[PDB]
Amino acid sequence: RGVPLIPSDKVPLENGKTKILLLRVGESRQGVVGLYQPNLPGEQGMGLSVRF
């Protein structure tokens, strides 16, 4: 019905018996959003830092 099925081996699977999820994403649509820490020392990426 126009909504794609996305693969992820991280969805649990135990003797068969897995699960399927349906998401709406976005802050403006009141959906699901991810949260990260914007300013970091090191700051190798979005919410990621490497330090000596």
């Binding site: 820490q37 970091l40 020392p41 830092s49 330090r51």
Partner: protein
């Protein structure tokens, strides 16, 4: 110092050695990062 204040000086003047005091400040990296 002048001794018994000719002008003589004392042969064993006091020497002041600066002392050091230390403190280790520990901060978790998640507390400062977040």
């Amino acid at each position: 110092q002048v001794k018994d204040a000719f002008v003589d000086y004392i042969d064993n003047p006091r020497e002041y050695l600066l002392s050091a005091v230390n403190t280790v400040v520990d901060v978790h990296t998640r507390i400062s990062d977040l």
